[PDB]
């Protein structure tokens, strides 16, 4: 008969006799992580990367990456007898002649998009809350290379099927930008193609980079990135027990081994629904990449859309300084290389500007930094403008505007719109600060009016602390608190009466589940209050 | 029937540039064919920005806008779906404002005459009437029965030839 | 609350007098038959001031003389509480944007943006309704 208690004790004595992971494990388990919703945004990019591993190891058991020409003679009826590369025929064998291969192919593209979206959402959590300061300067730099490597990993990914829609993206980007670089010339163009476009060793070179070379650097950087946040510990917003040298939150073994394991089950469950329901990349509609053909919607994915929108907005500015020429593509290769330079080296050009070079462990709330919130929201508004000018032909057809006037609202807008998002966010972040001082001077502005007996409509503010015989109470200090604005979020709503959604409980079991519920949170309140007074 | 392999390769060679089942960004795109069929998707739209694939008075040649077998094949590929005098008078009433006077409502210079319609024939007119045009509301199913469409097409054709 | 209800019972006495007269004078004197596009909107605008009008009559027949209805009441009669009034909320800005992104799509005929606009309405009408009923968090 099985026991699973004596069998689990003698296994732990066996591990602790061979090895000795007793003091080593307990410090890892007793690791305290802050519970906050924003601190799970980096786990989506960590969990979408594991899905790209598992559905990408599958997807290379069926893909043949060559460029050798072969007629189809398979199962898809429009593409019969079409001269295609073998990279495109096996990409049509995954979709059609592998049982549930279209599903794993579509999951793998949506997991590629959830990856490169939740890196951008995670950059915005790091930027505005200020998690890149003194100890974590190099964790920004290790981080911001993973964003640049995720741009090129996905761009080398959808270029593997050798679609017509996805082959003109290579002809635009890798064959137009690399051909007009003034630093060395076109000498690089024969070094990453092996000849003229398309050559013969394009896709087997983009299959090597995309499997081992770039995900061997991404996984090596992630391993040097989650092992920084593990050992220099995680930051926290200021609050009741948060005093710049604590980590107030929850431990690892009972909690956060569950809510970070169940969150991996729910990120994967979304990509199961999105990978099965929503179609992502039909490479069977537009046929193989033949250079005579044409596609009316030649657009990259949304992480590479700001690069295509940058080419469309720069005007036709060439130079001709000598007998040689300098094309329009110099303004993108120095435009892409300057965005990637002000995004890697940002925390070193705020230590120089502000001068604040002290060891910061408490995050700062993004309404309390009105300039860097306004520099940041300038950059979202400039990113959103470039990615809404790369799809201007779809804005032309569907939204009925123009195809000529969507660049002039982009090229004039590239200067005007990030100038007025700076003003409407610097004056927004300061007015959010003034809303936090009205809830401290006067209190939580509730709704109850109560006409006094001589007129005099008042609003019966809630004092949020000690009271006084004067009308407004003693004013509190700010100290980075979130400061609840509504009275239902404080203790004024109340329980709806325990029971089912249709039938109640017999009210002896109701007063026991609300006396032991208003005292189980009152025990939680005097716990931090008797810990905040121990520090101060 | 029309060969759908030829239809796919013709779509890729000549229409993929503005249409990936979507519509061309520049100006106004033709868009996805509504009620796609040989009768309307086959009938060209020379008027407007869209170029004219079929060339009138054209002998077999290597350089050509479209091929009778090529047209049918592409119209089919896009279309996956996955009293003659009495008829003319009725067309004038429904389309009396623009068709009447044989002229064009959008442009006074533009006309419904064969020179304006180039290589016109009854089938091409019937087809554009059925689903109407890029700027003209479709008439089949929605407004006019097949006899009425046939009669109005014949009246317009006889008026333009004479 | 008498002359709040009588204000809606004079209008429904006029519109019923202006829908009987309009239906009869277009029954015997119009150039064709009875005109329906105007007598519909007059039988239902004496239905506007009859759903509203008879509801104010049922309320003025149940309520006593409140301090507004008395002729010369002192100002010290409203010593109680007025009620609840939302002091500030960013939910009306996000219902107007959500209903104007289901009307751009209804104008341009984009079914992918009507159905994205209807779902933005419901997830923001949920925000305005549920705003003063949440309770704290459970952590």
């Amino acid at each position: 008969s099985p026991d699973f208690a004596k069998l689990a004790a003698a296994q732990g004595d066996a591990i602790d006799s061979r090895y000795h992971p007793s003091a080593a494990v307990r410090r890892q388990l007793n690791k305290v992580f802050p519970t906050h919703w924003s601190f799970l945004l980096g786990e989506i990019a960590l969990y979408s990367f594991i899905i790209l591993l598992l559905t990408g190891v599958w997807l290379t058991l069926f893909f043949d990456p060559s460029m050798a020409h072969v007629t189809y003679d398979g199962v898809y009826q429009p593409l019969r007898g079409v001269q295609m590369s073998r990279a495109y025929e096996t990409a049509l064998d995954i979709s059609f002649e592998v049982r549930g291969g279209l599903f794993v192919r579509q999951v793998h593209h949506w997991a590629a998009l959830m990856f490169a979206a939740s890196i951008m959402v995670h950059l915005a959590r790091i930027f505005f809350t200020g998690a890149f300061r003194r100890p974590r300067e190099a964790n920004w730099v290790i981080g911001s290379l993973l964003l640049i490597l995720a741009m090129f990993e996905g761009f080398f990914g959808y270029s593997l099927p050798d679609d017509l829609l996805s082959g003109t993206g290579i002809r635009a980007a890798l064959s137009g930008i690399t051909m007009g670089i003034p630093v060395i010339g076109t000498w690089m163009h024969w070094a990453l193609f092996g000849g003229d476009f398309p050559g013969e060793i394009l896709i087997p070179r983009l299959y090597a980079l995309h499997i081992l070379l770039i995900p061997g650097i991404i996984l090596a950087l992630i391993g040097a990135h989650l092992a920084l946040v593990w050992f220099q510990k995680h930051t926290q917003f200021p609050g009741p027990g948060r005093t710049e040298t604590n980590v107030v939150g929850v431990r690892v073994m009972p909690v956060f081994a569950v809510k970070s394991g169940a969150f991996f089950a729910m990120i994967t469950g979304v990509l199961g629904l999105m990978g099965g329901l929503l179609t992502i990349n039909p490479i069977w509609n537009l046929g193989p990449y033949k250079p005579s053909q044409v596609s009316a919607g030649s657009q990259p994915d949304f992480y590479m859309m700001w690069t295509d929108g940058l080419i469309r907005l720069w005007p036709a500015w060439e130079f001709y300084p000598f007998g040689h020429t300098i094309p329009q593509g110099v303004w993108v290769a120095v435009g892409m290389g300057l965005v990637f330079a002000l995004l890697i080296a940002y925390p070193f050009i705020e230590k120089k500007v502000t001068g604040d070079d002290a060891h910061h462990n408490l995050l700062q709330r993004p309404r309390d930094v009105p300039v860097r919130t306004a520099i940041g929201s300038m950059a979202i508004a400039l990113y959103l403008l470039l990615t809404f000018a790369c799809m201007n032909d779809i804005i032309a057809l569907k939204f009925h505007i123009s195809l000529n006037a969507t660049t002039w609202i982009g090229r004039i807008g590239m200067v005007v719109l990030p100038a007025i998002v700076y003003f409407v966010a610097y004056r927004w972040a300061i007015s959010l600060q003034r809303s936090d001082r009205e809830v401290l001077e006067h209190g939580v502005e509730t709704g109850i009016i109560k006409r006094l007996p001589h007129g005099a409509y008042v609003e019966l503010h809630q004092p949020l602390g000690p009271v006084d015989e004067h009308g407004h109470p003693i004013p509190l200090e700010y100290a980075g608190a979130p400061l609840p604005k509504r009275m239902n979020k404080l203790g004024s709503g109340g329980a709806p009466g325990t029971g089912s959604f249709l039938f109640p409980d017999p009210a002896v079991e109701h007063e026991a589940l609300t006396e032991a519920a208003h005292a189980s949170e009152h025990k939680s309140l005097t716990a931090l209050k008797e810990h905040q007074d121990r520090i101060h | 029937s029309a060969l759908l392999r030829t239809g796919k390769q013709l779509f890729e060679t000549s229409c993929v540039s503005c249409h990936g089942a979507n519509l061309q960004g520049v100006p106004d795109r033709g868009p996805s064919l509504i009620g796609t069929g040989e009768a309307a998707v086959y009938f060209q739209v020379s008027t407007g920005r869209m170029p004219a694939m079929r060339g009138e008075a054209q002998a077999p040649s290597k350089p050509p806008h479209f091929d009778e077998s090529q047209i049918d094949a592409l119209g089919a590929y896009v279309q996956a779906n996955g009293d003659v005098a009495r008829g003319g008078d009725l067309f004038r009433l429904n389309c009396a404002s623009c068709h009447n006077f044989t002229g064009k409502g959008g442009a006074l210079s533009s006309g419904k005459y064969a020179p304006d319609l180039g290589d016109a024939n009854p089938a091409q007119i019937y087809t554009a009437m059925l689903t109407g045009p890029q700027n003209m509301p479709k008439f089949s199913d929605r407004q006019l029965t097949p006899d009425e469409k046939r009669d109005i097409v014949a009246y317009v054709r006889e008026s333009a030839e004479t | 609350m008498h002359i709040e209800a009588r204000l809606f019972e004079i209008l429904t006495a006029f519109f019923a007098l202006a829908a009987v007269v309009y239906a009869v004078l277009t029954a015997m004197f119009a150039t064709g038959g009875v005109e329906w596009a105007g007598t519909t909107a007059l039988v239902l605008t004496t239905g506007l001031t009859l759903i509203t009008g008879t509801f104010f009559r049922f309320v003025a027949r149940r309520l006593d003389t409140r301090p507004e209805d008395y002729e010369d009441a002192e100002i010290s009669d409203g010593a109680g509480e007025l009620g609840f009034f939302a002091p500030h909320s960013w939910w009306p800005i996000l219902i107007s944007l959500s209903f104007s992104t289901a009307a751009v799509g209804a104008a341009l005929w984009l079914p992918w943006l009507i159905a994205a606009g209807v779902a933005f309405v419901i997830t923001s009408v949920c925000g305005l309704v549920f705003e003063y009923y949440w309770g704290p968090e459970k952590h």
Binding site: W37, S118, N285, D393 | - | -
Partner: peptide
Amino acid sequence: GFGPAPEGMAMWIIGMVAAIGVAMWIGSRA
């Protein structure tokens, strides 16, 4: 269009909404 643009639009309003909206239920607000 049916390529990367309505698919990229459907990422942010379906996928990342139901990946942030989950994290606001698992996580806290402080």
